[PDB]
Amino acid sequence: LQEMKDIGVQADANAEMRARERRDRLHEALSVNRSRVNQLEKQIAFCEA
Amino acid sequence: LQEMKDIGVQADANAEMRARERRDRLHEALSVNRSRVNQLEKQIAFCEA
Amino acid sequence: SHKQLATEQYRHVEMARELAEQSGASSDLETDHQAASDHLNLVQTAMRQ
Amino acid sequence: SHKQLATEQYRHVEMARELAEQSGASSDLETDHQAASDHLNLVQTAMRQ
């Protein structure tokens, strides 16, 4: 238990699934943001040329 | 000790830092390759347009 | 013709001055999501304990 | 000019194809690197235990 509290993680299965799902969703959303930046940069290049 | 057998990973310290180095440089190399591919694709779109 | 293109260039400059910021933010978010996945792994470990 | 246009079309096709190959490669590498980081965490845990 002292080890538990030194790491301090609440270690409840429900919170575990929720946190992991949220971080995965944020991974995907951020990938979407990077892709969006890529396409808009493509547009910048096209228009400039 | 039974838990150590269960995990089965030999997990030596030398192996430890070596593995982390390998995989981290691998991550960054991946990211760079992805960037280069994107750059070239953008060039190709330029040419087509 | 002369008056059209300059304005178009300035609009594109604005758009690029948005894309670069989205890009930097995206990279920082990538690091943040890596850290979040690390926290997930900590919770995963805490499950067995 | 028609012959130059056709030739550029050819070159574009070739480059686009090879870049599609590289994109697939990058995605596979992404999966590999996810597994890699997982392994790193495993090794650290083995150290501590």
Q: Are B16 and D44 within 8 A, CB to CB? A: yes
| Contact with chain C for residue A44, Cβ under 8 A | yes
Which method resolved this structure? Answer: cryo-EM
Q: What span, in angstroms and rounded, lies between the C-alpha atoms of A11 and C46?
A: 5
Which among D39, C8, C26 is positioned nearest to B35, based on CA atoms? C26
Amino acid at B13: A
Rg (CA), chain D: 21
Angstrom resolution of this structure: 13.0
Q: Are B43 and D32 within 8 A, CB to CB? A: no
Q: What span, in angstroms and rounded, lies between the C-alpha atoms of A35 and A41?
A: 10
3-state secondary structure of C12: helix
In angstroms, the first-to-last Cα distance of chain A is: 64
Which residues touch C33 (CB under 8 Å, ≥6 apart)?
A23, A26, A27, A30
In angstroms, the first-to-last Cα distance of chain D is: 72
Give residue for tokens 């270690």. Answer: A11
Give residue for tokens 């799902």. Answer: A21
DSSP calls for chain A: -HHHHHHT----HHHHHHHHHHHHHHHHHHHHHHHHHHHHHHHHHHHH-
Question: Which residues of chain A does B45 touch, with a Cβ-Cβ cutoff of 8 Å?
Answer: 42, 45-46
